[PDB]
Design a protein around this ligand. Sequence first.
Ligand code: NA
Lengths: 67, 55
Amino acid sequence: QERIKAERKRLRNRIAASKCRKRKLERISRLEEKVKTLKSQNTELASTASLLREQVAQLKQKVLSHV
Amino acid sequence: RNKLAAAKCRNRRRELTDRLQAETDQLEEEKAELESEIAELQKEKERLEFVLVAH
Ligand code: NA
């Protein structure tokens, strides 16, 4: 039975490996989702910023027009 | 007494999680700065409007 215990060790190792893969794929999935959300947010913010710049440009223009 | 399994686990194929985590960092910072400049642009907008009605 000196060998069966090594087969047990083998099985434990294959389990550990499997669990590792599952945790890694879950982390990669969360991160991908994160990067997606952040990209959407940064696109909306970038839009807001652009619009605000346009507005400020017009206000400044008018202000100068009344000098 | 199996922490070694976890360590070598988080050492295998690090390129993916590394790239996704770095991109996550760059996007978090890009976001923060965008929010800041939105705040500043809004302040400037308010300032210009006040100046535009007070003279
Ligand atoms: Na201001």
